[PDB]
Design an enzyme around this catalytic site. Structure first.
Site, PDB file in Angstrom:
ATOM      1  N   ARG A   7      -3.456  13.530   5.218  1.00 28.45           N
ATOM      2  CA  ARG A   7      -2.622  12.396   4.812  1.00 28.45           C
ATOM      3  C   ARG A   7      -2.695  11.236   5.807  1.00 28.45           C
ATOM      4  O   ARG A   7      -2.585  10.075   5.415  1.00 28.45           O
ATOM      5  CB  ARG A   7      -1.160  12.830   4.622  1.00 28.45           C
ATOM      6  CG  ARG A   7      -0.490  13.407   5.868  1.00 28.45           C
ATOM      7  CD  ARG A   7       0.999  13.616   5.658  1.00 28.45           C
ATOM      8  NE  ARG A   7       1.593  14.410   6.734  1.00 28.45           N
ATOM      9  CZ  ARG A   7       1.502  15.735   6.843  1.00 28.45           C
ATOM     10  NH1 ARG A   7       0.835  16.451   5.943  1.00 28.45           N
ATOM     11  NH2 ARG A   7       2.080  16.353   7.868  1.00 28.45           N
ATOM     12  N   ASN A   8      -2.881  11.559   7.087  1.00 33.90           N
ATOM     13  CA  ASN A   8      -2.956  10.553   8.151  1.00 33.90           C
ATOM     14  C   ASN A   8      -4.372  10.032   8.425  1.00 33.90           C
ATOM     15  O   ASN A   8      -4.536   9.036   9.133  1.00 33.90           O
ATOM     16  CB  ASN A   8      -2.361  11.113   9.450  1.00 33.90           C
ATOM     17  CG  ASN A   8      -0.854  11.298   9.374  1.00 33.90           C
ATOM     18  OD1 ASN A   8      -0.142  10.486   8.782  1.00 33.90           O
ATOM     19  ND2 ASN A   8      -0.361  12.365   9.991  1.00 33.90           N
ATOM     20  N   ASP A  20       0.901  15.340  14.816  1.00 37.77           N
ATOM     21  CA  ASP A  20       0.877  15.361  13.351  1.00 37.77           C
ATOM     22  C   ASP A  20      -0.515  15.009  12.819  1.00 37.77           C
ATOM     23  O   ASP A  20      -0.710  13.976  12.178  1.00 37.77           O
ATOM     24  CB  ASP A  20       1.933  14.409  12.768  1.00 37.77           C
ATOM     25  CG  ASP A  20       2.035  14.495  11.249  1.00 37.77           C
ATOM     26  OD1 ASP A  20       2.243  13.442  10.612  1.00 37.77           O
ATOM     27  OD2 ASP A  20       1.899  15.608  10.694  1.00 37.77           O
ATOM     28  N   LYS A  32       1.851  -3.050   8.893  1.00 38.88           N
ATOM     29  CA  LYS A  32       2.997  -2.148   8.827  1.00 38.88           C
ATOM     30  C   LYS A  32       4.247  -2.851   9.347  1.00 38.88           C
ATOM     31  O   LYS A  32       4.190  -3.598  10.326  1.00 38.88           O
ATOM     32  CB  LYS A  32       2.733  -0.870   9.627  1.00 38.88           C
ATOM     33  CG  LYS A  32       3.878   0.143   9.577  1.00 38.88           C
ATOM     34  CD  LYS A  32       3.380   1.587   9.581  1.00 38.88           C
ATOM     35  CE  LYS A  32       2.680   1.957  10.882  1.00 38.88           C
ATOM     36  NZ  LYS A  32       3.643   2.159  11.997  1.00 38.88           N
ATOM     37  N   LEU A  87       0.829  -1.205   0.000  1.00 35.79           N
ATOM     38  CA  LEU A  87       0.000   0.000   0.000  1.00 35.79           C
ATOM     39  C   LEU A  87       0.867   1.260   0.000  1.00 35.79           C
ATOM     40  O   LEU A  87       0.598   2.200  -0.751  1.00 35.79           O
ATOM     41  CB  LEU A  87      -0.939   0.010   1.210  1.00 35.79           C
ATOM     42  CG  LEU A  87      -1.855  -1.206   1.383  1.00 35.79           C
ATOM     43  CD1 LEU A  87      -2.673  -1.080   2.660  1.00 35.79           C
ATOM     44  CD2 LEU A  87      -2.768  -1.370   0.175  1.00 35.79           C
ATOM     45  N   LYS A 115       7.243   0.235   5.581  1.00 35.24           N
ATOM     46  CA  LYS A 115       6.270  -0.047   4.525  1.00 35.24           C
ATOM     47  C   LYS A 115       4.994  -0.681   5.072  1.00 35.24           C
ATOM     48  O   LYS A 115       5.004  -1.296   6.139  1.00 35.24           O
ATOM     49  CB  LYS A 115       6.880  -0.943   3.441  1.00 35.24           C
ATOM     50  CG  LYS A 115       7.380  -2.298   3.931  1.00 35.24           C
ATOM     51  CD  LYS A 115       7.781  -3.189   2.763  1.00 35.24           C
ATOM     52  CE  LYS A 115       8.451  -4.468   3.238  1.00 35.24           C
ATOM     53  NZ  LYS A 115       8.778  -5.385   2.112  1.00 35.24           N
ATOM     54  N   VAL A 116       3.904  -0.519   4.324  1.00 38.78           N
ATOM     55  CA  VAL A 116       2.601  -1.064   4.693  1.00 38.78           C
ATOM     56  C   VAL A 116       2.083  -1.974   3.582  1.00 38.78           C
ATOM     57  O   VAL A 116       1.652  -1.498   2.532  1.00 38.78           O
ATOM     58  CB  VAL A 116       1.576   0.063   4.947  1.00 38.78           C
ATOM     59  CG1 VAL A 116       0.185  -0.513   5.180  1.00 38.78           C
ATOM     60  CG2 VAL A 116       2.006   0.910   6.130  1.00 38.78           C
ATOM     61  N   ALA A 143       5.160   2.923   1.309  1.00 47.38           N
ATOM     62  CA  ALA A 143       6.537   2.671   1.738  1.00 47.38           C
ATOM     63  C   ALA A 143       7.344   3.964   1.862  1.00 47.38           C
ATOM     64  O   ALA A 143       7.448   4.731   0.904  1.00 47.38           O
ATOM     65  CB  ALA A 143       7.221   1.719   0.769  1.00 47.38           C
ATOM     66  N   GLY A 144       7.911   4.193   3.046  1.00 49.32           N
ATOM     67  CA  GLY A 144       8.732   5.376   3.310  1.00 49.32           C
ATOM     68  C   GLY A 144      10.202   5.106   3.061  1.00 49.32           C
ATOM     69  O   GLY A 144      10.563   4.470   2.070  1.00 49.32           O
ATOM     70  N   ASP A 172      -1.493   7.563  12.381  1.00 47.50           N
ATOM     71  CA  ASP A 172      -0.184   8.114  12.037  1.00 47.50           C
ATOM     72  C   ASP A 172       0.661   7.055  11.331  1.00 47.50           C
ATOM     73  O   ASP A 172       1.192   6.147  11.972  1.00 47.50           O
ATOM     74  CB  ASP A 172       0.528   8.623  13.299  1.00 47.50           C
ATOM     75  CG  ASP A 172       1.773   9.449  12.991  1.00 47.50           C
ATOM     76  OD1 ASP A 172       2.000   9.800  11.812  1.00 47.50           O
ATOM     77  OD2 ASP A 172       2.528   9.753  13.939  1.00 47.50           O
ATOM     78  N   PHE A 196      12.331   3.874   5.780  1.00 44.88           N
ATOM     79  CA  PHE A 196      12.662   2.713   6.611  1.00 44.88           C
ATOM     80  C   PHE A 196      11.425   1.910   7.028  1.00 44.88           C
ATOM     81  O   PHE A 196      11.490   1.119   7.972  1.00 44.88           O
ATOM     82  CB  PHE A 196      13.413   3.166   7.869  1.00 44.88           C
ATOM     83  CG  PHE A 196      14.437   4.241   7.616  1.00 44.88           C
ATOM     84  CD1 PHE A 196      14.306   5.498   8.195  1.00 44.88           C
ATOM     85  CD2 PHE A 196      15.527   3.997   6.791  1.00 44.88           C
ATOM     86  CE1 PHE A 196      15.249   6.491   7.961  1.00 44.88           C
ATOM     87  CE2 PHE A 196      16.474   4.984   6.551  1.00 44.88           C
ATOM     88  CZ  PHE A 196      16.336   6.233   7.137  1.00 44.88           C
TER      89      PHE A 196
HETATM   90  C1  LIG Z   1      -2.171   8.638  17.267  1.00 46.58           C
HETATM   91  O1  LIG Z   1      -2.115   7.334  17.833  1.00 46.58           O
HETATM   92  C2  LIG Z   1      -2.117   6.457  16.764  1.00 46.58           C
HETATM   93  C3  LIG Z   1      -3.307   5.913  16.331  1.00 46.58           C
HETATM   94  C4  LIG Z   1      -3.304   5.036  15.268  1.00 46.58           C
HETATM   95  C5  LIG Z   1      -2.120   4.704  14.644  1.00 46.58           C
HETATM   96  C6  LIG Z   1      -2.128   3.753  13.493  1.00 46.58           C
HETATM   97  O2  LIG Z   1      -0.942   3.963  12.738  1.00 46.58           O
HETATM   98  C7  LIG Z   1      -1.130   3.476  11.457  1.00 46.58           C
HETATM   99  C8  LIG Z   1      -0.756   2.189  11.139  1.00 46.58           C
HETATM  100  N1  LIG Z   1      -0.893   1.648   9.923  1.00 46.58           N
HETATM  101  C9  LIG Z   1      -1.429   2.440   8.986  1.00 46.58           C
HETATM  102  C10 LIG Z   1      -1.596   1.885   7.614  1.00 46.58           C
HETATM  103  O3  LIG Z   1      -2.541   0.826   7.598  1.00 46.58           O
HETATM  104  C11 LIG Z   1      -3.446   1.160   6.604  1.00 46.58           C
HETATM  105  N2  LIG Z   1      -2.982   1.551   5.411  1.00 46.58           N
HETATM  106  C12 LIG Z   1      -3.948   1.847   4.539  1.00 46.58           C
HETATM  107  C13 LIG Z   1      -3.542   2.299   3.239  1.00 46.58           C
HETATM  108  C14 LIG Z   1      -2.391   3.023   2.843  1.00 46.58           C
HETATM  109  N3  LIG Z   1      -2.385   3.271   1.530  1.00 46.58           N
HETATM  110  N4  LIG Z   1      -3.526   2.702   1.107  1.00 46.58           N
HETATM  111  C15 LIG Z   1      -3.887   2.763  -0.293  1.00 46.58           C
HETATM  112  C16 LIG Z   1      -4.266   2.105   2.087  1.00 46.58           C
HETATM  113  C17 LIG Z   1      -5.287   1.754   4.842  1.00 46.58           C
HETATM  114  N5  LIG Z   1      -5.737   1.365   6.036  1.00 46.58           N
HETATM  115  C18 LIG Z   1      -4.783   1.067   6.922  1.00 46.58           C
HETATM  116  N6  LIG Z   1      -5.128   0.647   8.209  1.00 46.58           N
HETATM  117  C19 LIG Z   1      -1.826   3.739   9.206  1.00 46.58           C
HETATM  118  C20 LIG Z   1      -1.672   4.267  10.469  1.00 46.58           C
HETATM  119  O4  LIG Z   1      -2.048   5.566  10.762  1.00 46.58           O
HETATM  120  C21 LIG Z   1      -2.893   5.997   9.703  1.00 46.58           C
HETATM  121  C22 LIG Z   1      -0.935   5.252  15.091  1.00 46.58           C
HETATM  122  C23 LIG Z   1      -0.926   6.129  16.153  1.00 46.58           C
END
Ligand SMILES: COc1ccc(COc2cnc(COc3nc(-c4cnn(C)c4)cnc3N)cc2OC)cc1
Length: 293
Positions: free
Chosen positions: A164-165, A160, A58, A30, A37-38, A32-33, A178, A35
């Protein structure tokens, strides 16, 4: 951050979340930064229900070392302490034993809110699926506020908040989170040498002070993102000495094209120079939930 500030390494990782890594089957990447990726994946027998479902996983890109391993674990320990809410990216499980550190979470199909609004706007201009309207934009803001209100109630600070988040899932439900180390390479521009300067409050820029009120300033910028259909904050203005004086001296962006007077007025309240005078996330909810309904 978590006020008490709590050292995230000192927090206990709960074994209740543990999941067998061999019960994960990976799919398309989905994001990738540098260091991180998701990658999406199918989790077999997740939780008490043993639900077979698609989840976002992630993980650290191979070129990531000690600082990253603790950094990702710090995010796992925070998500475990926070609990669960309808408008936050919920932790489903994790894999610590016998390999790299994985973090399984909900899968939001429509992706992040910034890219969603930009694609949908272009879809609506197409003629010249289902077109966006004001109630949808007010709905997204209302949900993101509820999530931040839940975060603040656990004495937790985001540092943050941005479109985007914010992730949109099935039936248009906005979830705040995040990405972190799994950042977008296309979003590298916004992070000045790295911090998101355009989304931060003055006290966070100059005094390095981060509070629940500083997140409200960011939420004000998040509203400007939503009701401009995904424009970059302070469009055309470059981040330099001149920008910092403007932000400190009380410069504010013009009313975006699709913002009602009362909605834009709430952004100005969020951009109060004095942190304590800004709206509470609970106040923003009750208002926006009313303007939605
Ligand atoms: C503030 O305290 C907190 C609260 C929640 C978090 C969660 O941290 C994350 C972990 N993982 C992901 C990524 O997972 C996902 N990616 C996609 C995706 C990406 N691109 N595309 C096309 C789809 C969709 N849905 C997903 N669940 C996104 C996070 O934050 C947004 C961190 C800190």
């Amino acid at each position: 951050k978590i006020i008490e500030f709590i050292d995230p390494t000192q927090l206990p990782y709960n074994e209740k979340w543990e999941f067998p890594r061999n019960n994960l089957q990976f799919g398309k990447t989905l994001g990738a930064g540098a260091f991180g990726k998701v990658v999406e994946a199918t989790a077999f027998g997740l939780g008490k229900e043993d639900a077979v479902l698609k989840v976002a996983v992630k993980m650290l890109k191979s070129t990531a070392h000690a600082d990253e391993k603790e950094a990702l674990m710090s995010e796992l320990k925070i998500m475990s302490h926070l609990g669960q809410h309808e408008n936050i990216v919920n932790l489903l499980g994790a894999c610590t034993h016998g390999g790299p550190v994985l973090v399984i979470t909900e899968y939001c199909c429509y992706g992040d809110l910034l890219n969603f609004l930009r694609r949908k706007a272009e879809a609506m201009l197409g003629p010249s699926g289902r077109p966006l309207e004001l109630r949808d934009l007010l709905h997204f803001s209302s949900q993101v506020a509820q999530g931040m209100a839940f975060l603040a109630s656990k004495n937790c600070i985001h540092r943050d908040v941005a479109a985007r988040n914010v992730l949109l899932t099935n039936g248009h439900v906005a979830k705040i989170g995040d990405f972190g180390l799994a950042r977008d390479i296309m979003n590298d521009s916004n992070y000045i040498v790295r911090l998101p300067v355009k989304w931060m409050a003055p006290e966070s820029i100059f005094d390095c002070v981060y509070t629940v009120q500083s997140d409200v300033w960011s939420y004000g910028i998040l509203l400007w993102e939503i009701f401009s259909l995904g424009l970059n904050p302070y469009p055309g203005i470059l981040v330099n000495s001149k920008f910092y004086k403007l932000v400190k001296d009380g410069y504010q962006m013009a009313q975006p094209a699709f913002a009602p007077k009362n909605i834009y007025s709430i952004m100005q309240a969020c951009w109060a120079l004095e942190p304590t005078h800004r709206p509470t996330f609970q106040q923003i909810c009750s208002f926006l939930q009313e303007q939605a309904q």
